């Protein structure tokens, strides 16, 4: 528990977790005219954080890919002599590690604020993700229901008078 829990870019263990790919996909189906200035500021701060985060992700993945490439080459560490094979084979191993990292969702205070806000901006973003990005919204709604968030857009809504628009995954009642 660091000493910067106030920081917007920071996150908590139980905060809403969203992948970088999911965030970039969500950016596609949103319009700035339909967001309040506060929501626009939230999105701008989120982009400010993501600008550094996306670039740093390969930095985080580098050691794992380097170790995997060494293991693939063998049990011999030949230093400069093996750089050609190490970085030719690592040129495909590191993309796999970055793929896994990007598919891995990470919690963020900005993510939870933008998604779970109980205002017009929150409703708008949730509805846009539900309509234009059903695949992402299914997982997002499952996560929200598991984390005890109740909204009319959630497919797991037990007090709704209209049938869900997507498959409801198994969960504990």
């Amino acid at each position: 528990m660091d000493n910067n829990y106030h920081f917007w870019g920071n996150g908590d263990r139980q905060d809403v977790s969203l992948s970088y790919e999911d965030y970039y996909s969500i950016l596609d189906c949103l319009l700035d005219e339909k967001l309040s200035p506060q929501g626009l500021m939230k999105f701008k701060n989120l982009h400010e954080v993501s600008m550094y985060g996306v670039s740093y992700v390969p930095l985080y993945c580098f050691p794992v890919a380097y170790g995997i490439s060494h293991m693939l080459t063998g049990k011999v560490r030949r230093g400069h002599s093996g750089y050609r094979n190490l970085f030719s084979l690592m040129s495909v191993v590191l993309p796999f590690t970055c793929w896994y990292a990007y598919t891995t969702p990470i919690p963020r205070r900005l993510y939870t604020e933008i998604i779970c806000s109980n205002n017009a901006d929150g409703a708008y973003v949730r509805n846009r993700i539900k309509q234009q990005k059903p695949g992402i919204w299914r997982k997002l709604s499952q996560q929200l229901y598991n984390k005890n968030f109740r909204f009319p857009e959630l497919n797991q809504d037990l007090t709704a008078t209209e049938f869900p628009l997507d498959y409801v995954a198994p969960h504990k009642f």
Binding site: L31, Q131, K139, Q142, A169
Partner: protein, 49 residues
């Protein structure tokens, strides 16, 4: 790798199931010219049924 992971199951058989036309549930904040998209989705659903 240790906590709850949302399921990836989805409908694989019903055609055009995920072409969700605008309605009260999804609000009406979509791209303005998606009226034609909604009409086409309605026509496709009618043809299927």
């Amino acid at each position: 790798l240790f906590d709850f992971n949302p399921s990836s199951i989805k409908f694989e058989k019903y055609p055009f199931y995920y072409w969700i036309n605008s309605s009260q549930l999804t609000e009406f904040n979509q791209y303005r010219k998606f009226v034609i998209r909604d009409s086409i989705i309605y026509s496709l659903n009618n043809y299927i049924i």
